Amino acid sequence: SHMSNKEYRPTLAQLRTFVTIAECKHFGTAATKLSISQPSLSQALVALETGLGVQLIERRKVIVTPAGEKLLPFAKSTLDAAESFLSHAKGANGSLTGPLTVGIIPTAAPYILPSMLSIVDEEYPDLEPHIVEDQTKHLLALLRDGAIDVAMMALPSEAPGMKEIPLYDEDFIVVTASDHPFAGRQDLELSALEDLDLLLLDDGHSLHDQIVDLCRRGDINPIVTRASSLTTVMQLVVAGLGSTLVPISAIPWECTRPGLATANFNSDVTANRRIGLVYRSSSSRAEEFEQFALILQRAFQEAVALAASTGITLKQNV
Amino acid sequence: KEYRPTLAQLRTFVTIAECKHFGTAATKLSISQPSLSQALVALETGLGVQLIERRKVIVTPAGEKLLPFAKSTLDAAESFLSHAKGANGSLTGPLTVGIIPTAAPYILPSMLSIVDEEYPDLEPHIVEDQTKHLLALLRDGAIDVAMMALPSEAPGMKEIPLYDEDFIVVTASDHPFAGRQDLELSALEDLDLLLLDDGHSLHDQIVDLCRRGDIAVTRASSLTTVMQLVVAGLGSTLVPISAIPWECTRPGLATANFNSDVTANRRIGLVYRSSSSRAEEFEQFALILQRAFQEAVALAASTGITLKQNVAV
Amino acid sequence: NKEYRPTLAQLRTFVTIAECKHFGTAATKLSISQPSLSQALVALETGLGVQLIERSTRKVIVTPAGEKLLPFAKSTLDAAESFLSHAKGANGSLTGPLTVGIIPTAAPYILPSMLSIVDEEYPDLEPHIVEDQTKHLLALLRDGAIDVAMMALPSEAPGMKEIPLYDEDFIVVTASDHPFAGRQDLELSALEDLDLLLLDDGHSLHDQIVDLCRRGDINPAVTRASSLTTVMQLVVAGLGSTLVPISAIPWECTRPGLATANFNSDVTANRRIGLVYRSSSSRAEEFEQFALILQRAFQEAVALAASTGITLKQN
Amino acid sequence: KEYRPTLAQLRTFVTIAECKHFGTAATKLSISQPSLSQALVALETGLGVQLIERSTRKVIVTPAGEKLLPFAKSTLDAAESFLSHAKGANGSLTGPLTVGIIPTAAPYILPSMLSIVDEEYPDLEPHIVEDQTKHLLALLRDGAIDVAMMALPSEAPGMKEIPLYDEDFIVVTASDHPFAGRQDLELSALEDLDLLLLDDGHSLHDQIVDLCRRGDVTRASSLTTVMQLVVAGLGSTLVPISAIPWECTRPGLATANFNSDVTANRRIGLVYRSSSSRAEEFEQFALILQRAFQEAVALAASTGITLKQN
Numbered sequence A: 001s002h003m004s005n006k007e008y009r010p011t012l013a014q015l016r017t018f019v020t021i022a023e024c025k026h027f028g029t030a031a032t033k034l035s036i037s038q039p040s041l042s043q044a045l046v047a048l049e050t051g052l053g054v055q056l057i058e059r060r061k062v063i064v065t066p067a068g069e070k071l072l073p074f075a076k077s078t079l080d081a082a083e084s085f086l087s088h089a090k091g092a093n094g095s096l097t098g099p100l101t102v103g104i105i106p107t108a109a110p111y112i113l114p115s116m117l118s119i120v121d122e123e124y125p126d127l128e129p130h131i132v133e134d135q136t137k138h139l140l141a142l143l144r145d146g147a148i149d150v151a152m153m154a155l156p157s158e159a160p161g162m163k164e165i166p167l168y169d170e171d172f173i174v175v176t177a178s179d180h181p182f183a184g185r186q187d188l189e190l191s192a193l194e195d196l197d198l199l200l201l202d203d204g205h206s207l208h209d210q211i212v213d214l215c216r217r218g219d220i221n222p223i224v225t226r227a228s229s230l231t232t233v234m235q236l237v238v239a240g241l242g243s244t245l246v247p248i249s250a251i252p253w254e255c256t257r258p259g260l261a262t263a264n265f266n267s268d269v270t271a272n273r274r275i276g277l278v279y280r281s282s283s284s285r286a287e288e289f290e291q292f293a294l295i296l297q298r299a300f301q302e303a304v305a306l307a308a309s310t311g312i313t314l315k316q317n318v
Numbered sequence B: 001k002e003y004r005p006t007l008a009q010l011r012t013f014v015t016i017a018e019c020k021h022f023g024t025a026a027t028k029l030s031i032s033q034p035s036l037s038q039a040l041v042a043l044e045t046g047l048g049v050q051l052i053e054r055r056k057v058i059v060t061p062a063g064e065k066l067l068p069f070a071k072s073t074l075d076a077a078e079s080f081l082s083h084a085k086g087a088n089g090s091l092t093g094p095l096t097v098g099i100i101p102t103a104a105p106y107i108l109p110s111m112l113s114i115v116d117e118e119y120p121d122l123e124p125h126i127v128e129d130q131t132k133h134l135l136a137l138l139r140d141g142a143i144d145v146a147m148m149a150l151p152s153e154a155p156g157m158k159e160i161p162l163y164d165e166d167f168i169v170v171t172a173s174d175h176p177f178a179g180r181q182d183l184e185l186s187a188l189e190d191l192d193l194l195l196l197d198d199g200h201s202l203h204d205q206i207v208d209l210c211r212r213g214d215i216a217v218t219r220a221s222s223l224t225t226v227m228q229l230v231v232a233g234l235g236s237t238l239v240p241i242s243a244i245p246w247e248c249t250r251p252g253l254a255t256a257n258f259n260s261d262v263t264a265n266r267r268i269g270l271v272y273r274s275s276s277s278r279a280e281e282f283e284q285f286a287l288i289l290q291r292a293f294q295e296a297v298a299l300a301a302s303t304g305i306t307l308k309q310n311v312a313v
Numbered sequence C: 001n002k003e004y005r006p007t008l009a010q011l012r013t014f015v016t017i018a019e020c021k022h023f024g025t026a027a028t029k030l031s032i033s034q035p036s037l038s039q040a041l042v043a044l045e046t047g048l049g050v051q052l053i054e055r056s057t058r059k060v061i062v063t064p065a066g067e068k069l070l071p072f073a074k075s076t077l078d079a080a081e082s083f084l085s086h087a088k089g090a091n092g093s094l095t096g097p098l099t100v101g102i103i104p105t106a107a108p109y110i111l112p113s114m115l116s117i118v119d120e121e122y123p124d125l126e127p128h129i130v131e132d133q134t135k136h137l138l139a140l141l142r143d144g145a146i147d148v149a150m151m152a153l154p155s156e157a158p159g160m161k162e163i164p165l166y167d168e169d170f171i172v173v174t175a176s177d178h179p180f181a182g183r184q185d186l187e188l189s190a191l192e193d194l195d196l197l198l199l200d201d202g203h204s205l206h207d208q209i210v211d212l213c214r215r216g217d218i219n220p221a222v223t224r225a226s227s228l229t230t231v232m233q234l235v236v237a238g239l240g241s242t243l244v245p246i247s248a249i250p251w252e253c254t255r256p257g258l259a260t261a262n263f264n265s266d267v268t269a270n271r272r273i274g275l276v277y278r279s280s281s282s283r284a285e286e287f288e289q290f291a292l293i294l295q296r297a298f299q300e301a302v303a304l305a306a307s308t309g310i311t312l313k314q315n
Numbered sequence D: 001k002e003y004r005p006t007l008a009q010l011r012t013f014v015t016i017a018e019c020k021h022f023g024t025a026a027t028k029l030s031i032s033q034p035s036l037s038q039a040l041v042a043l044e045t046g047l048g049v050q051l052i053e054r055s056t057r058k059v060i061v062t063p064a065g066e067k068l069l070p071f072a073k074s075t076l077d078a079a080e081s082f083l084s085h086a087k088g089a090n091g092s093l094t095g096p097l098t099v100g101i102i103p104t105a106a107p108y109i110l111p112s113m114l115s116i117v118d119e120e121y122p123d124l125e126p127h128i129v130e131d132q133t134k135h136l137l138a139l140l141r142d143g144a145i146d147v148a149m150m151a152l153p154s155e156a157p158g159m160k161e162i163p164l165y166d167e168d169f170i171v172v173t174a175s176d177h178p179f180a181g182r183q184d185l186e187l188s189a190l191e192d193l194d195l196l197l198l199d200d201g202h203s204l205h206d207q208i209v210d211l212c213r214r215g216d217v218t219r220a221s222s223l224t225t226v227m228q229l230v231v232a233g234l235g236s237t238l239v240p241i242s243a244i245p246w247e248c249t250r251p252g253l254a255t256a257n258f259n260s261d262v263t264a265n266r267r268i269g270l271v272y273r274s275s276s277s278r279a280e281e282f283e284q285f286a287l288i289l290q291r292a293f294q295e296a297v298a299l300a301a302s303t304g305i306t307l308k309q310n
């Protein structure tokens, strides 16, 4: 590498050739991957190797040299930085264009995603959404570190550096085995919770805590079976091991399987969660996140309509 | 000459400590409330130690310290009885079963129904949690057995192999692999795989499949969330076949499989502490789980979706 | 019939015969008659449906079935004897088994004094020590596999009670030739000038040092260790600097090639250590007594640190 | 297919943002003003985004340009780092090397390894990851470390193993223990000890358990914690001989050994991906580790404590 060409600067195209060959271990496969001829591929590689004064590949199969193996991570970092520049460029210019990483709590995500993603695909076609489904405490940590842009969770977040956009109040519904005496009742009082063996998600889920708070309002303790997802809880409910409460957006996805019935509290009882969009108060993207909020409010209305389409009677309020 | 506690007295103490109500404790043991109180007071007087204080019943500091010794005695006595009976004793009483989240929802309906009908004195308790947590609960005695993928790679434990469960590829309806039954492992290169996060053994298994085939931001904690992403055209995934009737029938999904010569499956097993003396019972429980899986596989076949074909050796 | 459950008295008879190898000696050992012994044995054999001891002879022969069941009978009797023996102690404070969980960056430094205090002042305590990271200690506490846990507060674990023990200062540790060597007046912003080598992110000490940097770091990695002793070797080799709790000083910071420094009197750079237990426990009073032991043990660990001559943080 | 920026275009953008003038930017890059303008317009057209504004006697970056700048910068910095490392890439054991090491070897081997490296391989930039075996093998599979020092066999398909050395164990007891100072123990002596072990995640745990099987709950994460338990009379243990000067010289401990005919050791090796082309360098690194171990063993011998004879 004293035979280095001093003014020589590698191009991204040359680096792509190197990385591709290192990964494919065949010139022909590498060339087809890059949509170029084998002579073009070899010219790019030889230009790189001559420019650097370092042999990167030993020409029956392609083997990376010791030098090539040591430089491969630096080449990859360059290509990754360039891809990140290009992706960001799509977002810099407009509102809701380019990457947006959205954190969502597990008891909202699967039920809001179909409508949110369909609206985005049709109305914001340059948006590149990335979805991180995780519990609240992890989403707040990812928000603080910048690993996600916004988080959809229950409010209040009680997280000091954050702004909150209220989206909607989502009612709960009681879910029981088909043969349970509350099946189909629409007039329960809060005190009816005393008569249920509640099966709850573990303490890491905000839905656990919300159900426990509901029991408190009614002066009842909510309290060995631990479940990590609503679909597992539904199987336990079908099997007669207990009852639960789910958000109404879950209805079409969780509560239509055979062996379940539903019930609601009366009009005077409040049994809901407040969902909101949370982001770093230092962010300059308030305007975009406010537009995203409108999408989520529309998506929820569609999820609620999907719930009503099942025929399952929903909570009435006032 | 001097006072020696009976097992009956110890059962009364332990049951009261767990139930926190005399009436519930008495019904649990199929005795009257006076009989329960007589046994407890005989124990307390014989020992000269108050174990339970006067509306729910609360264990005293002394009772809390003696509780684990009472439990050990009852557990040793149960083990004597179970070994004397041998094979015919069968499964009775509490059994806490840990199960991984990508098996639990799909195996539970048939396992629980078999147990309810054919082992009516079995009292199953289900802990659905990720593998690392299940192994820690096993080590601390908080669960009895754990259903998970093998190898567990936990020195300290025994493994009963249950079955091999095939994967299936799940794509959007309009994806170009949709419906193919002849994929090679290298086809994984051409998919944007959406995986559960790194805490799930299914993540690691799919990654290993890619490595055998010589092959970051979007992550989910549940298969149902992944299916929504797949329907929306954000990527493809692999699921265990037992998931098919629960996750893969929603509109906008299609399936595909690898060819007959490709192995793309996970080995599920029942894991327990090698210090346990309950091998024979856990072996019977294993048979239940193997039957439950066969029923889950039949449910998958009932959908009409073509399943992986394997060289049947 | 199906409902039969052996009694301890029946098991004692079986085990004693198997061990004494003579029915008369066995009967006298249990202070019962030979007819009573035989009645208990045959009640056991009939209830089980298994012959345990052969029958037409004064010699004792355990059957194959009896030989296989003997160890299970023995375990039961040993567990029952242990219950009875511990009942004598159960009204005593800090008597019998106590399993104590401790975080790895406190355990090795608090244990010598703690264990010596326990040995001298609570001689009927049978301590068992589980050294593990915080998240694992909280899981063991929830499952009942440990009784109490020594870790940094707040635990943020619902269902736990916390007894605050003490605030333990950190100290900055550098290579001998580092320009901060011996300084006692650092500001928090001095952290910007260090290449910090930390334990991996499973350790609460990692997180605490990161939080310290955020305080003073307005707005805004490969080398990692699982133990402070490994970090110290990296520091001696000039690969970076670190912070350790003061109780670590005599064990980690006296090896050749290290120096120390402290932040000035106005800076807070410490961790709060506490004793955590299940709020459902009835043993508050004992755990409170145990807390006093740990507070004394820490004072002794701090005196050991002062004995090295290394200057400690002033507050 | 679609437009991809070149590094040349990014250099032009960044330099204009910094110089605030086209002519000065062009001179900074040793190109003509027309070349500079061509590169900028190609970038702006390719992206569909205006990055620079004419700006009242000087050149200003637009809102879009200001947001894209730091990152154009990241790309250029990554490219410079590639180029700078290329100068070093041909030399053996030069540049970054990330080395994984198991926790019951790391603290005892590192002083000597790091000193040898500092003096004799001054262009090597070591990074050390101390973690348990299973984690080291996962990091090696993902490429997050280059080599791993651990006990053999690794039982990891796709890895190559360079055997380094056999390291003897030594028995550690309280000073007043009846085996204290014995040099003739048989493996069956383990039956008579209350062994205090590291938790299950440590290969030393498993090795001691296997030793007990050949001869036929208090748990800690570090050997230093185990030593405190041993001093307090709660049990005995076994440690690798490289640990002796660091762990076993405190008042209240004594040592013992198995007899000459007994094998009680661990085989340490250097593990790496068998797809690597760096065999020759890793073989040289292995020699460093074998030398480091010899120095650790000499440190153990320097204490005066009697070591296992074979």
Ligand code: NA
Pocket (backbone or CB within 6 Å): C121
């Ligand atoms: Na005292």
